[PDB]
Amino acid sequence: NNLISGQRRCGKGRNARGIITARHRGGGHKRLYRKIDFRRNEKDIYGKIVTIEYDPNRNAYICLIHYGDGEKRYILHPRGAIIGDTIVSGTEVPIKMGNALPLTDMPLGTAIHNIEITLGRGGQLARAAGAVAKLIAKEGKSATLKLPSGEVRLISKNCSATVGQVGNVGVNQKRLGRAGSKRWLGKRPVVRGVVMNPVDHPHGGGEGRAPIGRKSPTTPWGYPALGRRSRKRNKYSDNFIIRRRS
Amino acid sequence: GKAALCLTKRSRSRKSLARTHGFRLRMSTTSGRALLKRRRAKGRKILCTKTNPSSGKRASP
Amino acid sequence: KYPRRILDVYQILQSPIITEAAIKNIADENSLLFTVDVRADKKMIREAISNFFGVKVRKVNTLIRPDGTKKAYIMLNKEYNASELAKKIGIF
RNA sequence: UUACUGUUCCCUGGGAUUGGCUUAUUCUAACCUUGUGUCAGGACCUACGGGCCAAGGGACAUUCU
RNA sequence: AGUAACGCAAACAUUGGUGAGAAUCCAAUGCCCCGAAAACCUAAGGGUUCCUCCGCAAGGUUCGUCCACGGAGGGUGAGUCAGGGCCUAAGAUCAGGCCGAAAGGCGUAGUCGAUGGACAACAGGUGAAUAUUCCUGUACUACCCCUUGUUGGUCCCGAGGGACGGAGGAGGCUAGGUUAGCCGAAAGAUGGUUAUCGGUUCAAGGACGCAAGGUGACCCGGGUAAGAAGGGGUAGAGAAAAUGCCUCGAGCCAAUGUUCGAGUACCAGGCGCUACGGCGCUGAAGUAACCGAUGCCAUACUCCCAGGAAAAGCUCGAACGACCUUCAACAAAAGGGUACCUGUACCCGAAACCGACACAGGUAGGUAGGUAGAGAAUACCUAGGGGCGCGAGACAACUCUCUCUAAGGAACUCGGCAAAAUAGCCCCGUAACUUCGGGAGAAGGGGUGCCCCCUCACAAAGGGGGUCGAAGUGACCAGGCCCGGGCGACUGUUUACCAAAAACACAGGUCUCCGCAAAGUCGUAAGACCAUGUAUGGGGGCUGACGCCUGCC
RNA sequence: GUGAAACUAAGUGGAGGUCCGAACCGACUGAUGUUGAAGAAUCAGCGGAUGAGUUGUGGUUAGGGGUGAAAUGCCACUCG
RNA sequence: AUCCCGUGUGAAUCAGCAAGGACCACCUUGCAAGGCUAAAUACUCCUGGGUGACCGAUAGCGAAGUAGUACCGUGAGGGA
RNA sequence: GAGUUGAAAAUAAGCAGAGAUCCGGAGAUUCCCGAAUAGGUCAACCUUUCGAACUUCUGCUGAAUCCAUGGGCAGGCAAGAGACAACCUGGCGAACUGAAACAUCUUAGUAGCCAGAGGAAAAGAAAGCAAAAGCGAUUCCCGUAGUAGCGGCGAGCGAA
Ligand SMILES: [Mg+2]
Ligand SMILES: [Mg+2]
Ligand SMILES: [Mg+2]
Ligand SMILES: [Mg+2]
Ligand SMILES: [Mg+2]
Ligand SMILES: [Mg+2]
Ligand SMILES: [Mg+2]
Ligand SMILES: [Mg+2]
Ligand SMILES: [Mg+2]
Ligand SMILES: [Mg+2]
Ligand SMILES: [Mg+2]
Ligand SMILES: [Mg+2]
Ligand SMILES: [Mg+2]
Ligand SMILES: [Mg+2]
Ligand SMILES: [Mg+2]
Ligand SMILES: [Mg+2]
Ligand SMILES: [Mg+2]
Ligand SMILES: [Mg+2]
Ligand SMILES: [Mg+2]
Ligand SMILES: [Mg+2]
Ligand SMILES: [Mg+2]
Ligand SMILES: [Mg+2]
Ligand SMILES: [Mg+2]
Ligand SMILES: [Mg+2]
Ligand SMILES: [Mg+2]
Ligand SMILES: [Mg+2]
Ligand SMILES: [Mg+2]
Ligand SMILES: [Mg+2]
Ligand SMILES: [Mg+2]
Ligand SMILES: [Mg+2]
Ligand SMILES: [Mg+2]
Ligand SMILES: [Mg+2]
Ligand SMILES: [Mg+2]
Ligand SMILES: [Mg+2]
Ligand SMILES: [Mg+2]
Ligand SMILES: [Mg+2]
Ligand SMILES: [Mg+2]
Ligand SMILES: [Mg+2]
Ligand SMILES: [Mg+2]
Ligand SMILES: [Mg+2]
Ligand SMILES: [Mg+2]
Ligand SMILES: [Mg+2]
Ligand SMILES: [Mg+2]
Ligand SMILES: [Mg+2]
Ligand SMILES: [Mg+2]
Ligand SMILES: [Mg+2]
Ligand SMILES: [Mg+2]
Ligand SMILES: [Mg+2]
Ligand SMILES: [Mg+2]
Ligand SMILES: [Mg+2]
Ligand SMILES: [Mg+2]
Ligand SMILES: [Mg+2]
Ligand SMILES: [Mg+2]
Ligand SMILES: [Mg+2]
Ligand SMILES: [Mg+2]
Ligand SMILES: [Mg+2]
Ligand SMILES: [Mg+2]
Ligand SMILES: [Mg+2]
Ligand SMILES: [Mg+2]
Ligand SMILES: [Mg+2]
Ligand SMILES: [Mg+2]
Ligand SMILES: [Mg+2]
Ligand SMILES: [Mg+2]
Ligand SMILES: [Mg+2]
Ligand SMILES: [Mg+2]
Ligand SMILES: [Mg+2]
Ligand SMILES: [Mg+2]
Ligand SMILES: [Mg+2]
Ligand SMILES: [Mg+2]
Ligand SMILES: [Mg+2]
Ligand SMILES: [Mg+2]
Ligand SMILES: [Mg+2]
Ligand SMILES: [Mg+2]
Ligand SMILES: [Mg+2]
Ligand SMILES: [Mg+2]
Ligand SMILES: [Mg+2]
Ligand SMILES: [Mg+2]
Ligand SMILES: [Mg+2]
Ligand SMILES: [Mg+2]
Ligand SMILES: [Mg+2]
Ligand SMILES: [Mg+2]
Ligand SMILES: [Mg+2]
């Protein structure tokens, strides 16, 4: 319970200047922040699951952990988890769901999530609901694996990760029945640029329902909206990429 | 039950107006320090119209 | 040990008030009316009357006029008598 | 706007920042990134940060011309 | 041009008085209006408009002896109300630090910052103008003194706690209301009559304690072993806390209630005085039943997804570190004593704020009576406040706001614009079509008052009989309906001041970009948002529920 | 009801960008006013009225800009 | 050319270097990459004195009286 | 050097040839806000341990880290801060306009903003002008001269 707090970055979408950078953010119901442990430190101790709580700040559920020393933590909810299951973070830990260990000690073809790219920062990849990363192979310094996007990235071997697939896979199946359910999440109505005036969007003017009237569809800031790859050329992580998603 | 178009002054509290037009607000920025320089050379009696103390009969609380 | 503010203790009491209501208050409440400095307090006024006339002060109540002049109701203990002290000054 | 002349974002080459051994690939020492790793005053910095030690990149890139 | 108008169609009228002078000022009587306000408080704001005396130049849309006007003087009393001396959110500043022609920008701790949290009072009386502020009575908070005991404490630090949503309805109470009873008074020129009129009231707080209410393991009432609230002990990095283990414990929860406070206090009425103001004595009864909250128990319970602030006060407790000390410090009961700053007037559904006006307007929140009624709608009334700041006559056209209008009934008209009609409750009966939810109150018909009985009133409804009227939800209040087609799916949003739509949005669908030091966006830069998120996610373009489909280059 | 389910009748429950309708927020039609009582109001009806609701207090975004369920609309009766 | 900067390169020391309007030669002149320095000069919110073919209350400073007052505006500000 | 207690009479009391009132020089006090600077703040107020905050100066002590740095303590009417019409210096740096349009150009290195400083500032004691003859720091005025030149060789600009 003490891991929950109300100290959050109020004023979503607004930067320090106070101008809207990330549009269509506002309203929505209030939500407290949960402290989830992604590093999975405090190794070589058993901890059992008791609750499966609701986290408004994400798509997946969480799980409360109770260790023998009295500490309490939050983690993501794997798929086939049930109350009473144990979890361990270590090196010689057996390879089953809920446990955490580096990629060196894992076999090939494992369902993995909560992957970290660097040591200490904690897991960053494969957090969403129903997310999973398949380990393809490993060779010497680093280890390649597949991501939910279908891309094959080359991650270091000493990085930690959690086994299994994230819970509540069946969340896309429900369709938001009406617009009010969208505003409850904090997503304001999206206006189309073709309806605007020319000063506001390049597609604006023209009597009637105007077509694009341009060589290509464009963003509100002039650049095209389709096909142009936005990845920075000669990026630091360019050698760690094996292929492109699909 | 709709206010007319010309009601731009809805009798807001003087506490907030001092925080927006008060003496301490002008002395913070460089422009406000020059603002008072213009009103003193002008010779105006009341330099800041929208100002009130923290206590006394003028206090908004 | 410090007072609240620092100023002339002998300026705390400018002059009394002479009205038909004030004189009526002396006999009913055993009180006295005095105009006081704006920077004055109930402690300094309580200590003041204890030293000038050598009498006890049951309670002190004050207020600031619209003109920025402070007034002070001073109720003496029942042992003394404000009417007797009034004649010592000259006012009835 | 496929009017004229220009500016900016962005891409690319030469030069500086910028170095070593090999036949373009490697190496670590500049430089980039990170630490809930550690030390620190009267005290705290698990509050940014500083010093130290490590980890991942690496003379590419960022920056200037 | 002495022309228009003098700011609602709530309504004035008489007597008497004041005075040089009165439709306009004062009083009395009667009439009429508001009465979820046109009533009483109160926040912001205004800033002396409040009270008394004097005056009437100007101001008041008339008058004026009056006034929110003018002059003079006076008036706002707090340990408990509100705010500060306590805390913090949004947000604003920011030691150092980073960035930058300058100004300066970003930003860490920290500090400011109520619209929140925390914290101690009521009744009655006094009255030119103030009182939960003054007086009386009864309480509370903090500090100090005193008396014993303890004899290391106080900060830092650790932990607990504070600490929270919406919707829904049930139950137990009270406020409040009605009636009855009791007490007192009354003849209100009428046919009769007392069946009429009035009163029947009291808080904060202290002390006690609760179900037939809610909760707490065990059965179809009994039995029984763990088990609730609430405590204790123990192990490990290990004081508290947390986690695990063991153990005691049938009672717990709190609005209400009882009693004191609470006196012949308050009070109808009566006896006398008067300059008619009130004063001075006297002062009975002071109970019960029914109805019953939108308020209390109550972040009590149930359900649901959108998943519902922080800090301090408070409580528990070791070590390290800091300060101080044998009382000079901590802690317990009684008693006694002591008690900072500012606001407090007056208006506040307005003539004093906001609208240039004494403007048919706008202005958060609290209190919420009686009859009928589902109701805070509506109609008439109580408390209380008002009669709208020019009037008197006359009763042409014409205009506006309203009522009825023979026969006909949309022939009017761009157009059934406007007006008229419908209307409630209880029964009967309800189509095509459909996404099976709807359509639907479909449509369309019958009944409706009062009195007696059935009937035991079973809170009702129903049945039978009788009776009045042209007319029974008789007033106010209170749906018009049906067939067909186009657009858009629908609830919603939009050009404040000529356009509410077929436009926008919408759930959904599709394409494309982004592997986190992310894309994108704002910045000279540092950096910020995106995100304390991680491809079931984020940004962007088009389309716009659903159903059948979405071709060729 | 079945082998178990599917399915199905009652009762309980009280959901909804649900219905009628005051306050509150809005402003569709018409009349009146149009040197107005009023620089957008009065009167009579009308729409939503547990929600994408309304509102107070205290704040944020400032012009080669901001904001915009997007009208070139709003940003102190002033906005291509 | 002379003078002053960003980027990148990079000399010489009197037998020398720079300048003399691309540059070379000869001659002349001068000695950069350190610094300070009065006077003649420009201005009037003001002070004292003096003088006006300057105004005389719609003039002259906005202002001959409580003028940057009254008044208007959220404010900057405008302004009798 | 004879009457006085402002404008500003009146009233009530004083001072004064033992030389007042008044006029000058040097001093004292100088409440609150304000650079504001004990802390906070809605300027003229609040809370307070009662303090010129911060930077600088003079000392003491001496983190990571040996020397050091950064902190901490104390002293010290204690240097600096802010204000200031115009002129002056430096930095940023327009547009309408003119060219009968307009971009090179002009308006213009003007306006305005920021910063700083003085009564003046800035400049300034030849790595200079000049041309075969000579001058001997800088600045200002006359004049050279609207000349030599620059310029979509256009408008216009303009030396020594
Ligand atoms: Mg449009
Ligand atoms: Mg465009
Ligand atoms: Mg177009
Ligand atoms: Mg077309
Ligand atoms: Mg309203
Ligand atoms: Mg007071
Ligand atoms: Mg470190
Ligand atoms: Mg750190
Ligand atoms: Mg005429
Ligand atoms: Mg006429
Ligand atoms: Mg008129
Ligand atoms: Mg007339
Ligand atoms: Mg009526
Ligand atoms: Mg009055
Ligand atoms: Mg008159
Ligand atoms: Mg008159
Ligand atoms: Mg008056
Ligand atoms: Mg209080
Ligand atoms: Mg700083
Ligand atoms: Mg901060
Ligand atoms: Mg604070
Ligand atoms: Mg508050
Ligand atoms: Mg308090
Ligand atoms: Mg009153
Ligand atoms: Mg808690
Ligand atoms: Mg009779
Ligand atoms: Mg323990
Ligand atoms: Mg009062
Ligand atoms: Mg009052
Ligand atoms: Mg109101
Ligand atoms: Mg009104
Ligand atoms: Mg008006
Ligand atoms: Mg009623
Ligand atoms: Mg009504
Ligand atoms: Mg009535
Ligand atoms: Mg009248
Ligand atoms: Mg009137
Ligand atoms: Mg009238
Ligand atoms: Mg007819
Ligand atoms: Mg016809
Ligand atoms: Mg016809
Ligand atoms: Mg109609
Ligand atoms: Mg009708
Ligand atoms: Mg029907
Ligand atoms: Mg139909
Ligand atoms: Mg109706
Ligand atoms: Mg047609
Ligand atoms: Mg629609
Ligand atoms: Mg609609
Ligand atoms: Mg319109
Ligand atoms: Mg509409
Ligand atoms: Mg319209
Ligand atoms: Mg629209
Ligand atoms: Mg990025
Ligand atoms: Mg469309
Ligand atoms: Mg609805
Ligand atoms: Mg409705
Ligand atoms: Mg609207
Ligand atoms: Mg209406
Ligand atoms: Mg309605
Ligand atoms: Mg309707
Ligand atoms: Mg509807
Ligand atoms: Mg601004
Ligand atoms: Mg501009
Ligand atoms: Mg406007
Ligand atoms: Mg040269
Ligand atoms: Mg030459
Ligand atoms: Mg030379
Ligand atoms: Mg003049
Ligand atoms: Mg004249
Ligand atoms: Mg200060
Ligand atoms: Mg300060
Ligand atoms: Mg000094
Ligand atoms: Mg200065
Ligand atoms: Mg130009
Ligand atoms: Mg031109
Ligand atoms: Mg021209
Ligand atoms: Mg000077
Ligand atoms: Mg001089
Ligand atoms: Mg000079
Ligand atoms: Mg000089
Ligand atoms: Mg110099």
From Swiss-Prot, chain A:
Entry-linked InterPro entries: NA-bd_OB-fold, Rib_uL2_dom2, Ribosomal_uL2, Ribosomal_uL2_bac/org-type, Ribosomal_uL2_C, Ribosomal_uL2_CS, Ribosomal_uL2_dom3, Ribosomal_uL2_RNA-bd_dom
Entries under SUPFAM superfamilies matching the protein: Nucleic acid-binding proteins, Translation proteins SH3-like domain
Domain of life (superkingdom): Eukaryota
Region (Disordered): 195-246
Keywords, comma-separated and alphabetical: Chloroplast, Methylation, Plastid, Ribonucleoprotein, Ribosomal protein
SMART domains: Ribosomal_L2, Ribosomal_L2_C
GO MF: RNA binding; rRNA binding; structural constituent of ribosome; transferase activity
Xref: Pfam families: Ribosomal_L2, Ribosomal_L2_C
Primary location: plastid
GO cellular component terms listed in the entry, alphabetical order: chloroplast; mitochondrial large ribosomal subunit
Subcellular compartments: Plastid, Chloroplast
One GO BP: mitochondrial translation
Family: Belongs to the universal ribosomal protein uL2 family.
Subunit structure: Component of the chloroplast large ribosomal subunit (LSU). Mature 70S chloroplast ribosomes of higher plants consist of a small (30S) and a large (50S) subunit. The 30S small subunit contains 1 molecule of ribosomal RNA (16S rRNA) and 24 different proteins. The 50S large subunit contains 3 rRNA molecules (23S, 5S and 4.5S rRNA) and 33 different proteins.
Listed NCBIfam families: rplB_bact
Name of this protein: Large ribosomal subunit protein uL2cz/uL2cy
Upper lineage: Eukaryota, Viridiplantae, Streptophyta, Embryophyta, Tracheophyta
Gene behind this protein: rpl2-A
UniProtKB/Swiss-Prot annotation, chain B:
Subunit-level organization: Component of the chloroplast large ribosomal subunit (LSU). Mature 70S chloroplast ribosomes of higher plants consist of a small (30S) and a large (50S) subunit. The 30S small subunit contains 1 molecule of ribosomal RNA (16S rRNA) and 24 different proteins. The 50S large subunit contains 3 rRNA molecules (23S, 5S and 4.5S rRNA) and 33 different proteins.
Family: Belongs to the bacterial ribosomal protein bL34 family.
Location(s) in or outside the cell: Plastid, Chloroplast
Source species of the chain: Spinacia oleracea (Spinach)
Name the record gives this protein: Large ribosomal subunit protein bL34c
Functional description taken from the UniProt entry: Component of the chloroplast ribosome (chloro-ribosome), a dedicated translation machinery responsible for the synthesis of chloroplast genome-encoded proteins, including proteins of the transcription and translation machinery and components of the photosynthetic apparatus.
Swiss-Prot record, chain C:
Compartment(s): Plastid, Chloroplast
Similarity field: Belongs to the universal ribosomal protein uL23 family.
Functional description taken from the UniProt entry: Component of the chloroplast ribosome (chloro-ribosome), a dedicated translation machinery responsible for the synthesis of chloroplast genome-encoded proteins, including proteins of the transcription and translation machinery and components of the photosynthetic apparatus.
Quaternary state and interactors: Component of the chloroplast large ribosomal subunit (LSU). Mature 70S chloroplast ribosomes of higher plants consist of a small (30S) and a large (50S) subunit. The 30S small subunit contains 1 molecule of ribosomal RNA (16S rRNA) and 24 different proteins. The 50S large subunit contains 3 rRNA molecules (23S, 5S and 4.5S rRNA) and 33 different proteins.
Note: Two forms of the protein exist; they have the same N-terminal sequence and approximately the same molecular weight.
Protein name: Large ribosomal subunit protein uL23c
Lineage: Eukaryota, Viridiplantae, Streptophyta, Embryophyta, Tracheophyta
